[PDB]
Scaffold this active site. Structure first.
Site, PDB file in Angstrom:
ATOM      1  N   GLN A  11       0.823  -1.206   0.000  1.00 45.64           N
ATOM      2  CA  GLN A  11       0.000   0.000   0.000  1.00 45.64           C
ATOM      3  C   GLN A  11       0.860   1.260   0.000  1.00 45.64           C
ATOM      4  O   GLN A  11       0.726   2.118  -0.880  1.00 45.64           O
ATOM      5  CB  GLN A  11      -0.943  -0.001   1.201  1.00 45.64           C
ATOM      6  CG  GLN A  11      -1.719   1.305   1.356  1.00 45.64           C
ATOM      7  CD  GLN A  11      -2.698   1.286   2.520  1.00 45.64           C
ATOM      8  OE1 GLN A  11      -2.632   2.129   3.412  1.00 45.64           O
ATOM      9  NE2 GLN A  11      -3.617   0.328   2.508  1.00 45.64           N
ATOM     10  N   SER A 140       6.986   0.223   2.408  1.00 45.00           N
ATOM     11  CA  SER A 140       7.001   0.509   3.833  1.00 45.00           C
ATOM     12  C   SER A 140       7.822  -0.546   4.567  1.00 45.00           C
ATOM     13  O   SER A 140       8.010  -1.666   4.085  1.00 45.00           O
ATOM     14  CB  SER A 140       5.577   0.544   4.399  1.00 45.00           C
ATOM     15  OG  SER A 140       4.958  -0.735   4.336  1.00 45.00           O
ATOM     16  N   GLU A 254      26.074   7.048  -9.386  1.00 42.78           N
ATOM     17  CA  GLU A 254      26.621   8.247  -8.763  1.00 42.78           C
ATOM     18  C   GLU A 254      26.058   8.469  -7.364  1.00 42.78           C
ATOM     19  O   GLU A 254      26.742   9.042  -6.510  1.00 42.78           O
ATOM     20  CB  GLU A 254      26.352   9.459  -9.653  1.00 42.78           C
ATOM     21  CG  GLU A 254      27.196  10.672  -9.315  1.00 42.78           C
ATOM     22  CD  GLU A 254      27.139  11.733 -10.393  1.00 42.78           C
ATOM     23  OE1 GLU A 254      26.817  11.387 -11.552  1.00 42.78           O
ATOM     24  OE2 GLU A 254      27.411  12.912 -10.079  1.00 42.78           O
TER      25      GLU A 254
HETATM   26  N1  LIG Z   1       3.709   7.694   4.199  1.00 44.31           N
HETATM   27  C1  LIG Z   1       2.832   6.715   4.000  1.00 44.31           C
HETATM   28  N2  LIG Z   1       2.831   5.616   4.832  1.00 44.31           N
HETATM   29  C2  LIG Z   1       1.939   4.618   4.628  1.00 44.31           C
HETATM   30  C3  LIG Z   1       1.019   4.684   3.593  1.00 44.31           C
HETATM   31  N3  LIG Z   1       0.266   3.560   3.635  1.00 44.31           N
HETATM   32  C4  LIG Z   1       0.688   2.793   4.666  1.00 44.31           C
HETATM   33  N4  LIG Z   1       1.715   3.445   5.297  1.00 44.31           N
HETATM   34  C5  LIG Z   1       2.495   2.970   6.447  1.00 44.31           C
HETATM   35  O1  LIG Z   1       2.936   1.667   6.127  1.00 44.31           O
HETATM   36  C6  LIG Z   1       2.801   0.802   7.237  1.00 44.31           C
HETATM   37  C7  LIG Z   1       1.804  -0.300   6.903  1.00 44.31           C
HETATM   38  O2  LIG Z   1       2.268  -1.031   5.794  1.00 44.31           O
HETATM   39  P1  LIG Z   1       1.445  -1.137   4.419  1.00 44.31           P
HETATM   40  O3  LIG Z   1       2.219  -0.562   3.255  1.00 44.31           O
HETATM   41  O4  LIG Z   1       0.096  -0.471   4.550  1.00 44.31           O
HETATM   42  O5  LIG Z   1       1.238  -2.734   4.305  1.00 44.31           O
HETATM   43  P2  LIG Z   1       1.452  -3.562   2.940  1.00 44.31           P
HETATM   44  O6  LIG Z   1       2.804  -3.276   2.325  1.00 44.31           O
HETATM   45  O7  LIG Z   1       0.342  -3.241   1.969  1.00 44.31           O
HETATM   46  O8  LIG Z   1       1.426  -5.115   3.376  1.00 44.31           O
HETATM   47  P3  LIG Z   1       0.108  -5.906   3.874  1.00 44.31           P
HETATM   48  O9  LIG Z   1       0.293  -6.288   5.323  1.00 44.31           O
HETATM   49  O10 LIG Z   1      -0.021  -7.161   3.047  1.00 44.31           O
HETATM   50  O11 LIG Z   1      -1.121  -5.047   3.698  1.00 44.31           O
HETATM   51  C8  LIG Z   1       2.304   1.645   8.390  1.00 44.31           C
HETATM   52  O12 LIG Z   1       3.435   2.059   9.116  1.00 44.31           O
HETATM   53  C9  LIG Z   1       1.661   2.830   7.707  1.00 44.31           C
HETATM   54  O13 LIG Z   1       1.724   3.980   8.515  1.00 44.31           O
HETATM   55  C10 LIG Z   1       1.016   5.787   2.751  1.00 44.31           C
HETATM   56  O14 LIG Z   1       0.210   5.865   1.824  1.00 44.31           O
HETATM   57  N5  LIG Z   1       1.928   6.798   2.962  1.00 44.31           N
HETATM   58 MG   LIG Z   2      -1.676  -3.919   2.199  1.00 46.25          MG
END
Ligand SMILES: Nc1nc2c(ncn2[C@@H]2O[C@H](COP(=O)(O)OP(=O)(O)OP(=O)(O)O)[C@@H](O)[C@H]2O)c(=O)[nH]1
Ligand SMILES: [Mg+2]
Ligand SMILES: Nc1ncnc2c1ncn2[C@@H]1O[C@H](COP(=O)(O)OP(=O)(O)CP(=O)(O)O)[C@@H](O)[C@H]1O
Ligand SMILES: Nc1nc2c(ncn2[C@@H]2O[C@H](COP(=O)(O)OP(=O)(O)O)[C@@H](O)[C@H]2O)c(=O)[nH]1
Ligand SMILES: [Ca+2]
Ligand SMILES: [Ca+2]
Ligand SMILES: [Ca+2]
Ligand SMILES: [Ca+2]
Ligand SMILES: [Mg+2]
Ligand SMILES: [Mg+2]
Lengths: 438, 54, 425, 328
Positions: A11, A140, A254
């Site tokens: 996500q 993330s 670089e």
């Molecule tokens: N900056 C920012 N952080 C995000 C965003 N979406 C999720 N996060 C952060 O990412 C972490 C959660 O991981 P996700 O990326 O939502 O999970 P995932 O990679 O989809 O993996 P799954 O568990 O399968 O859903 C938390 O710390 C959230 O605060 C976003 O759109 N922007």
């Molecule tokens: Mg997810």
């Protein structure tokens, strides 16, 4: 001209990638349908922007990007959003059930079933590249896919592109917007498995972005949309050199040469200024000296930490807007006689500067006000290890009780991988203290 | 200070200012890890289905 | 589409289950005929988690109604939303279970279980991405308790990679039907310890006290108790039924709430509980939400420590103020949150409030104080078992005394396990 | 209600501070490892500054300044004074010092050989006293070496040595507060240029028969020392000594301010310092050492600790002067 392939995982990676490609299009003048009027070489060309965009016979400019998520709902947004016409469906890869914030689920159980499909889709983009130079991987730390699947993908990429560079944009977990208690577990796990496969990784702490949005944009409770707009500005200024004419950080190699003398110590601290609310009708335009001085305020860093208590290994200043070298050096001379800037003895005390005359672009109707000039500093300072120490501490508190460990063992992961990844982090903190402390 | 490597173009310029001089595992090895993890999964499930059969 | 399969078994399970479907059917804008008449797309964005879509754009609950006698289910079929349930999903016998766990689990229940699993399989086979199952039942009777846990064990065998969630009503001598309820509850708890991922512990003692002391109901009926339960069930499932980031499916909820596999028994809470047009500020929701008088398990939270907490706020309100109040609760009473699980309190906010309220808050706590509930059952169990009283009702169904001894020891272990982590630092 | 944690049990000052906070009814103490605290009374070694200021909804304050060790270490101070232009080697109030590793050996000899060449005072002291450089270097190999004040101010009756201890509090805004009350840790033994040389309060009670003859605990407070200066030398403590002390304090603290200030930081710092001064026969004040974790005089614990709560703690966490603000 050498191409770069962007890979957005989970996500966070997908939504941030959605914001960057939107910003890229605005900067290069690419409309949502993929057409680019200013591009006179139809259906081809080796310009600077062609490192991120391919071209079709009909004149469409297609991002050299792949979106991967073990759940369909987030990537369905891209499939039906404003820039749906940019990507062809082969670039958007989705699963059915996600990693449930479980690194083991994303890496072993679910990742094993989709890894070959992603590589094949990535191979398709690599085959359109006359000189692929590497990848930019967005994800993330805390999510099950962003942490677990990313580390598996980075492993396979080292096997299938051993010579290509790999850079990360990593979202470091912050409880103010976090969604899982085990995010420290996934953070250490994926950092341990990815460490050898990443050449340069820009960590963004959601805490720092959150507070920047609240303090400088007057957002009471920022949303991912607020955070990602700001993160895309930082990402844009970091990749601008790859997409525009210039002589600093012109290829992915670089970045490693200019920012990473020690391979394991490949996490540069990013500091950005100015961040001005679009709601302020009139705002005093900050000068070159003011926005440069802001590069040494923790409140403007992507990770809250104190570079004064730590040493520098490299520093790049990336300016966008009305900036001439004379003002940069004047501002630097003043700052050096007022700040605590210590370099490691075996490194020169200097700054690699790049200036792009085009000022920053802002999403029409967004939160960031248009500014006459902005700067992104990339400094490899040992102070960023503060984030590792915070993370490793939270890890230690839970792991001493084995809290939640059964969720990972149940997916086929072994308990020893926890302490192995923790030992690797312990060594990483030791390296930072050797380089930065006397 | 000292300004070096000044490069200029239409879209901007870059340079460097100095203030002071100084003083992988194979696809086979990976696959063994994945299959080994999937093996432990099946073992733990088989033991569950054994417990349920009892 | 992460579908959930709902199962309700026995008298209690089918009565609370029916009210649950009446409540959420209203929230999602579904009428007793299955037609949608809402005014918000949020009502339908995740309607598929609990509802199947049929011909004419009808919405059919993915619910299976189970009992060893037809009584309560005939009432449900004639109730307000009786016609909305799929006729083929009524699975019932005729003999009953006599408030006897052995009858539901071993004799009478075994004859009927395969028929239920046939309906469960038909529902699961048509699921795009099945999350798991949620079961409503009591632990003090025979069908819900004895056959309910038999179903759980057989569902796990066929769907071992799916989440098993239950709303389990705990017996209390204050609101008691027979003296063997501690026997039936002790036998069921051991099943739950092993074969569920999440169990909301709903204590009939707590429900009665809230109706009497709080709502000012001098003579509470089961209908009054079930009004609290259906309101709590709507709250705890809010994150499943509406778009959100936190605890939005059964497995991510379990990953956030269960640090150790056996310690998956939750104390639910709800606020406001009023006997009514007054505005409830965000500070008020937060204080009441964490107030033991709003808990449904009859355990003192200050007698233990929180391993994990899930909070849900419903209605239009300041999310900034919500974040501030949640931080105040933790920072003000931080001794009651174990320090070896950082940031163990997660908060979600949904824009749609429950019926009749502008604002509400649902509390889901994994507290070591839940041991007080299991100690209570264990003491009542042992008071009879030491004299083997009423055992013949069970030995006559083929059970041996040894199985009671094991169930006793298992629950005492569960209590010892909670006490271990209440002293960990 | 505010919260705090205690991580330095051996702290006598903050033991009283902790006692005062609890006695206010508006502060609650937590376990040493509970993160949801407002105030940290940190440990003296390896204080985890990197974990502070990361608790949403908590204004966090700690009783130490990260980076202040440069001022409170023997070798650190010497290096800071010689290398800092704000102080420079043209520092008229710091004894000629050199850092020696068991390096500035060649420099120490270049000045030592000039003193025996010039036939002037050539006595030094080593710490981490002798007129022979070899005896000092041989000792460190078994540190810092600075000029020993051979012409010190001697109190009478007694013809005895002493030192001045000043307590300085720096709040989160970096105001410099000098506690109005100081102490003279005196030597109850007459000064002989051929126990009476080290004014340490511990060496006086363990190696001096006259411990407590002239003043209780070999501690003369300012009220008496001022009167002595008036009766004996026709001057006041303020004019002859205190001006120089105030000047030295702000000079040192203003020097490191850019490196340790928490003005724009995600957590805030305050710290109590202990400055030790020496006075020569010509009423010149010399800085000897800066203590980063100092104790207080038994009699003054109550007043000083109460001032820590007033200006350093309640200033950030208000509830429901004894200092001199060295302006800058
Ligand atoms: N900056 C920012 N952080 C995000 C965003 N979406 C999720 N996060 C952060 O990412 C972490 C959660 O991981 P996700 O990326 O939502 O999970 P995932 O990679 O989809 O993996 P799954 O568990 O399968 O859903 C938390 O710390 C959230 O605060 C976003 O759109 N922007
Ligand atoms: Mg997810
Ligand atoms: N350069 C110097 N000239 C004269 N006397 C000196 C001196 N350096 C030290 N002394 C004497 O030695 C005593 C001890 O000095 P020192 O700084 O080592 O105390 P200390 O640091 O060991 C304990 P504290 O931290 O409480 O001061 C001083 O009180 C003073 O009397
Ligand atoms: N809250 C609530 N509890 C009930 C209800 N009906 C029965 N109980 C409780 O459930 C237990 C009896 O179980 P019951 O469901 O009647 O037996 P079953 O039909 O064999 O499953 C006793 O502890 C009762 O207090 C109800 O409608 N609401
Ligand atoms: Ca072109
Ligand atoms: Ca490599
Ligand atoms: Ca029969
Ligand atoms: Ca059959
Ligand atoms: Mg009944
Ligand atoms: Mg000392």
């Amino acid at each position: 001209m050498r191409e770069c392939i962007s890979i957005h995982v989970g996500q966070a990676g997908v939504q941030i990638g959605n914001a960057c490609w939107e910003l890229y299009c605005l900067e290069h003048g690419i409309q949502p349908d993929g057409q680019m009027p200013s591009d006179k070489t139809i259906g081809g060309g080796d310009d600077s922007f062609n490192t991120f965009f391919s071209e079709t016979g009909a004149g469409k400019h297609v991002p050299r990007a792949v979106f991967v998520d073990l759940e369909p709902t987030v990537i369905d947004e891209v499939r039906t959003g404003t820039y749906r016409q940019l990507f062809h469906p082969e670039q958007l890869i989705t699963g059915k059930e996600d990693a449930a914030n479980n690194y083991a689920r994303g890496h072993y159980t679910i990742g094993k079933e989709i890894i070959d499909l992603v590589l094949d889709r990535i191979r398709k983009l690599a085959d359109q590249c006359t000189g692929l130079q590497g990848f930019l991987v967005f994800h993330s730390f805390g999510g099950g896919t962003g942490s677990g699947f990313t580390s598996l993908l980075m492993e396979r990429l080292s096997v299938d592109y051993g010579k290509k560079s790999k850079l990360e944009f990593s979202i470091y977990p912050a409880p103010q917007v976090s969604t899982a208690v085990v995010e420290p577990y996934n953070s250490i796990l994926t950092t341990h498995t990815t460490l050898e496969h990443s050449d340069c990784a820009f960590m963004v702490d959601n805490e720092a972005i959150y507070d920047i949005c609240r303090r400088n944009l007057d957002i009471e409770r920022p949303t991912y949309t607020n955070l990602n707009r700001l993160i895309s500005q930082i990402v844009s200024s970091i990749t601008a050199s790859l997409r525009f004419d210039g002589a600093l950080n012109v290829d992915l190699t670089e970045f490693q040469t200019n920012l990473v003398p020690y391979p394991r110590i490949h996490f540069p601290l990013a500091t950005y200024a100015p961040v001005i609310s679009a709601e302020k009708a009139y705002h005093e335009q900050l000068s070159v000296a003011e926005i440069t001085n802001a590069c040494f305020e923790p409140a403007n860093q992507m990770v809250k930490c104190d570079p004064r208590h730590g040493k520098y290994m490299a520093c790049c200043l990336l300016y966008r807007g009305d900036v001439v070298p004379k003002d940069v050096n004047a501002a630097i001379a003043t700052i050096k006689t007022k700040r605590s800037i210590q370099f490691v003895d075996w490194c020169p005390t200097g700054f690699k500067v790049g200036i792009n005359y085009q000022p920053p672009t802002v999403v029409p109707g967004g939160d960031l006000a248009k500014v006459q000039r902005a700067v992104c500093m990339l400094s490899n300072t040992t102070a960023i290890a503060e984030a590792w120490a915070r993370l490793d501490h939270k890890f230690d508190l839970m792991y001493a009780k084995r809290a939640f460990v059964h969720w990972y063992v149940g997916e086929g992961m072994e308990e020893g991988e926890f302490s192995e990844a923790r030992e690797d982090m312990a060594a990483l903190e030791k390296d930072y203290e050797e380089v930065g402390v006397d | 200070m000292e300004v070096i490597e000044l490069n200029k173009c239409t879209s901007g310029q870059s340079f460097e200012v100095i203030l002071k001089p100084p003083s992988d595992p194979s696809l086979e090895e990976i696959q063994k890890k994945l299959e080994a993890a999937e093996e432990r999964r099946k073992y733990q499930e088989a033991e569950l289905l054994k417990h349920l059969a009892e | 589409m992460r579908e959930i399969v709902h199962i309700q078994a026995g008298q209690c399970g089918n009565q609370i289950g029916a009210k649950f479907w009446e409540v959420i059917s209203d929230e999602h804008g579904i009428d007793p005929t299955g037609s949608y008449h809402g005014d918000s797309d949020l009502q339908l964005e995740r309607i598929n988690v609990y509802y199947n879509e049929a011909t004419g754009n009808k919405y059919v609950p993915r619910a299976i109604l189970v009992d060893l006698e037809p009584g309560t289910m005939d009432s449900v079929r004639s109730g307000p939303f009786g016609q909305i349930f799929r006729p083929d999903n009524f699975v019932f016998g005729q003999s009953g279970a006599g408030n006897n766990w052995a009858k539901g689990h071993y004799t009478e229940g075994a004859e009927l279980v395969d028929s239920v699993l046939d309906v469960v399989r038909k529902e699961s086979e048509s699921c795009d991405c099945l999350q798991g199952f949620q079961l409503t039942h009591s632990l003090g009777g025979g069908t819900g308790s004895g056959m309910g846990t038999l179903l759980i064990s057989k569902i796990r065998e066929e769907y071992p990679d799916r989440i098993m969630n239950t709303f389990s009503v705990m017996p209390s001598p204050k609101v008691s039907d027979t003296v063997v309820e501690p026997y039936n509850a002790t036998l069921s708890v051991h099943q739950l310890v092993e074969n569920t991922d999440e169990t909301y512990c709903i204590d009939n003692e707590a429900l009665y006290d809230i109706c009497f002391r709080t709502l000012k109901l001098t003579t509470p009926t089961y209908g009054d108790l079930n009004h609290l339960v259906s309101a709590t069930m709507s709250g705890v499932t809010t994150c499943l039924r509406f778009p959100g980031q936190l605890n939005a499916d059964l497995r991510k909820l379990a990953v956030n709430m269960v640090p150790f596999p056996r310690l998956h028994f939750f104390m639910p809470g709800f606020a406001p509980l009023t006997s009514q047009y007054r505005a409830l500020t965000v500070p008020e929701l937060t204080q009441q939400m964490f107030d033991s008088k709003n808990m449904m398990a009859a355990c003192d939270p200050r007698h233990g420590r929180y391993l994990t907490v899930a909070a849900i706020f419903r209605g239009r309100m300041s999310m900034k103020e919500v974040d501030e109040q949640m931080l105040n609760v933790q920072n003000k009473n931080s001794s009651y949150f174990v320090e070896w699980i950082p940031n163990n309190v997660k908060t979600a906010v949904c824009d749609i409030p429950p019926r009749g309220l502008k604002m509400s808050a649902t509390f889901i706590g994994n507290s070591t104080a839940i041991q007080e509930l299991f100690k209570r059952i264990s003491e009542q169990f042992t008071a009879m078992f030491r004299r083997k009283a009423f055992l013949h009702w069970y030995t006559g169904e083929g059970m041996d005394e040894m199985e009671f001894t094991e169930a006793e020891s298992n629950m005492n272990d569960l209590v010892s396990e909670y006490q271990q982590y209440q002293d960990a630092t | 209600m505010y919260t705090f944690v205690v991580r330095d049990e051996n702290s006598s000052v903050y033991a009283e501070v902790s006692r005062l906070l609890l006695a206010t009814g508006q502060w609650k103490r937590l376990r040493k490892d509970n993160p949801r605290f407002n105030l940290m009374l940190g440990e003296r070694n390896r204080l985890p500054f990197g974990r502070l200021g990361h608790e949403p909804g908590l204004v966090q304050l700690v009783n130490y300044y990260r980076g202040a060790d440069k001022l409170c270490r023997k070798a650190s101070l010497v290096k800071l004074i010689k290398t800092s232009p704000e102080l420079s080697e043209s520092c008229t109030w710091f004894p000629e010092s050199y850092v020696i590793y068991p390096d500035e050996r060649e420099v120490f000899l270049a000045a030592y050989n000039r003193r025996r060449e010039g036939r002037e005072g050539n006595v030094w002291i080593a710490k981490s006293i002798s007129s022979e450089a070899s005896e000092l270097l041989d000792f460190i190999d078994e540190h810092v070496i600075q000029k020993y004040l051979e012409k010190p101010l001697l109190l009478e009756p007694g013809h005895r040595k002493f030192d001045i201890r000043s307590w300085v509090l720096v709040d989160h805004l970096y105001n410099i507060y000098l506690y109005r009350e100081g102490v003279l840790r005196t030597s109850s033994e007459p000064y002989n240029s051929a126990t009476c040389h080290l004014t340490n309060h511990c060496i006086q009670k363990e190696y001096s028969k006259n411990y407590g003859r002239y003043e209780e605990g070999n501690e003369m407070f300012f009220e008496e020392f001022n009167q002595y200066l008036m009766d004996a030398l026709n001057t006041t403590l303020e004019n002859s000594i205190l001006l120089q002390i105030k000047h030295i304090i702000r000079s040192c603290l203003m020097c490191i301010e850019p490196a340790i200030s928490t003005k724009h930081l995600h957590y805030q710092s305050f710290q109590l310092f202990g400055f030790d001064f020496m006075v020569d026969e010509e009423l010149k004040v010399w800085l000897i050492e800066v203590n980063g974790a100092p104790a207080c005089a038994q009699k003054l614990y109550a007043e000083l600790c109460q001032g820590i709560v007033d200006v350093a703690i309640s200033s950030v966490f208000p509830l429901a002067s004894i200092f001199i603000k060295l302006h800058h």
